[PDB]
């Protein structure tokens, strides 16, 4: 597109966001929608049954109160938008002042940008590590603090899994072993129970609307299957997996077990910290450990094909980069593209929206792939989906658009700065502004109340706001960071568009974190090292792309990637341990203080029925 298309599109995206905020201001004041817009307060139990003033209110809660109110993962996520402003605001300013002889100017700027970015990341990594350590030290007792998950318990002809686990731990951790719970494959039973719930909803639907005999018959048949299955899963030795949740008397002991190799064969008796019981992805505990290697290989191949085939939708969007491509793809638009105003509106918004729609189901696919791979916790599944999404964006959204563009790399990049700018305004600015309306929950909330509610108690189930969406949010931020770092030395006018995005997204999400979103698991910012690593990868990619465009002076261009990686290793050595190792001293302090505070705690009673598959509880 051209400058006037950027101008027209910006005018429209600004006005559109403004309108969404007006609609929001109206909907949030209608009392029948409080259960949707203030869901967090209902979940906490703190709430009973101009127009942009919500912005200042979102900013009034101190970060420490937000950590206790919303959780640490929610706060650390939000700080990523803040990181974006810290990294790019001075880049946008210096790039403008200096770049808007030339060969060397570009090299110097590349160093200035890399150093600033690394400096900011170093400071952020230190900050997050300190928040994590304090958060964990003050964290309330929870079963995972004492529990490790043992995988690949070797077989024995005579002894059961339970006997092997009890014996191993009494012998090798004799002072602290307390109790264990063996993993059971109850996937069939769990599916029958979920199916029964769906059938029950249909029966309740038809009863409120009054087919009744049909749904009753399905309920009785499934109830019989459930009863039969409960007997078989409980007394069937093949339902027992060679895995167990092992609990210890102290946190110190659990830390020792979780952080050390137990046997001489490094692939057996594998120990890791257990997920909090609500963070356990129970279905994947039924996957035999040894199959995980093959499953990951298959998904790497499936990912290749997904990335490969998706090139076609990208090429389509790039065809639409010109007005001729637009009318050829959509001939019905010819009558309105002679008009200068509409030509700019369509040229701006159409390829932006088309790409956004094609990518709409991408995170569902990636989450399915992640589940196939066998991860056993919700937090791990979201981190892997974020990983794959990031790679996908690097190849299909960024490089493929640039290459396809040239088909319709050095020169190819500057030619697409405009495309990425209109994309950011549609996906970024208008995108987050519409998210605050949160239309999907309003619609589902009202449909449930209208047809699936028999009692007011059901209205507390209709209220499921979801969560921040680490797996769909983090990859968007990272794409914009990459575009910023790539375009900053060549087309600096891109940067103000990402700065508006980071600022707007920060205020919109801070609002949603406080009033709307729940948190499904608390990983205490365990994801931070991945966020850090992705930024480092983005710096390296930008530096290599610059070599191609600028040209090769090679020792300067080569040193940038080397120095950037050396920085990364410094940080892994110095800050990463706050996320991947649990100091024995810290474990001992919690144990000491807890004992003094609660001298009569029955720890075994507390932990004994934790980690029992919910279908049995």
């Amino acid at each position: 597109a051209t400058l006037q298309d950027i101008g027209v599109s910006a005018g429209i995206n600004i006005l559109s966001a403004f309108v969404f905020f007006i609609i929001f201001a109206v909907l949030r004041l209608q009392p029948f929608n409080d259960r949707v817009y203030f869901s967090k307060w209902y979940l906490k139990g703190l709430r009973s049954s101009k127009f942009l003033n919500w912005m200042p209110e979102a900013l009034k809660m101190p970060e420490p109160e937000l950590i206790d109110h919303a959780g640490l993962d929610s706060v650390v996520y939000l700080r990523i938008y803040w990181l974006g402003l810290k990294i790019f605001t001075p880049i946008a300013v210096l790039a403008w002042a200096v770049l808007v002889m030339r060969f060397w100017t570009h090299i110097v700027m590349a160093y200035a940008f890399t150093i600033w970015t690394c400096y900011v990341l170093m400071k952020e990594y230190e900050t997050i590590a300190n928040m994590r350590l304090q958060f964990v030290a003050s964290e309330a007792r929870r079963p995972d603090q004492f529990t490790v998950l043992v995988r690949n318990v070797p077989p024995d002809a005579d002894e059961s899994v339970s006997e092997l686990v009890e014996h191993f731990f009494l012998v090798n951790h004799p002072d602290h072993y307390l109790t264990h719970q063996v993993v059971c494959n109850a996937n069939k039973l769990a599916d029958l129970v979920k199916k029964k719930k769906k059938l029950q909803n249909w029966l309740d639907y038809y009863q409120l609307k009054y087919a009744i005999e049909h749904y009753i018959a399905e309920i009785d048949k499934i109830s019989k299957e459930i009863s039969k299955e409960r007997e078989e899963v409980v007394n069937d030795p093949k339902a027992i997996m060679p895995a167990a949740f092992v609990s210890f008397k102290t946190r110190w002991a659990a830390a020792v077990c979780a952080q050390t190799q137990q046997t001489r064969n490094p692939t057996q008796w594998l120990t890791e910290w257990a997920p909090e019981p609500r963070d356990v992805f129970w279905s994947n505990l039924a996957i035999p450990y040894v199959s995980l290697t093959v499953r990951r290989l298959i998904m790497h191949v499936a990912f290749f094909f997904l990335t490969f085939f998706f090139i076609v939708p990208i090429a389509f969007v790039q065809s639409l980069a010109t007005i001729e491509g637009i009318v050829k793809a959509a001939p019905f638009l010819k009558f309105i593209v002679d008009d200068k105003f509409m030509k700019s509106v369509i040229q701006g918004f159409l390829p932006g929206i088309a790409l956004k729609l094609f990518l709409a189901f991408l995170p569902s696919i990636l989450m399915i792939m992640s589940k196939f791979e066998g991860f056993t916790s919700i937090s791990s599944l979201e981190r892997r989906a974020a990983f794959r999404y990031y790679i996908f964006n690097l190849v299909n959204v960024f490089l493929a658009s640039v290459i396809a563009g040239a088909a319709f790399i050095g020169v190819a990049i500057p030619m697409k700065a405009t495309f990425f700018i209109t994309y950011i305004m549609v996906d970024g600015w208008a995108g987050v502004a519409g998210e605050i309306l949160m239309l999907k929950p309003l619609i589902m909330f009202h449909l449930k109340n209208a047809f699936l509610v028999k009692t007011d108690k059901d209205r507390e189930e209709a209220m499921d706001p979801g969560s921040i969406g680490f797996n769909t949010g983090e990859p968007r931020i990272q794409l914009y960071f990459l575009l910023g770092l790539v375009y900053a030395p060549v087309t600096p006018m891109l940067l103000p568009f990402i700065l508006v995005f980071f600022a707007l997204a920060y205020i919109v999400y801070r609002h949603q974190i406080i009033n709307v979103y729940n948190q499904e698991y608390e990983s205490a910012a365990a994801f931070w090292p991945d966020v850090h690593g992705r930024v480092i990868a983005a710096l390296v990619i930008s530096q290599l792309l610059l070599m191609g465009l600028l040209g090769t002076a090679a020792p300067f261009l080569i040193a940038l990637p080397v120095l950037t990686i050396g920085f990364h290793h410094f940080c892994k050595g110095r800050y990463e341990p706050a996320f991947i190792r649990y100091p024995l001293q810290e474990a001992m302090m919690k144990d000491t203080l807890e004992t003094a505070r609660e001298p009569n705690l029955n720890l075994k009673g507390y932990l004994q029925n934790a980690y029992v598959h919910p279908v049995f509880k």
């Binding site: 002042a97 200096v98 100017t105 110097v108």
Partner: peptide, 25 residues
């Protein structure tokens, strides 16, 4: 080498101000 580094640092600060003034304007 403390006796050389200290004034070297001072020379570098001036070198930076000069190079950037040239790039800036």
């Amino acid at each position: 080498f403390a006796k050389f580094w200290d004034p070297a640092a001072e020379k570098l600060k001036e070198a930076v101000k000069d190079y950037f003034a040239k790039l800036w304007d």
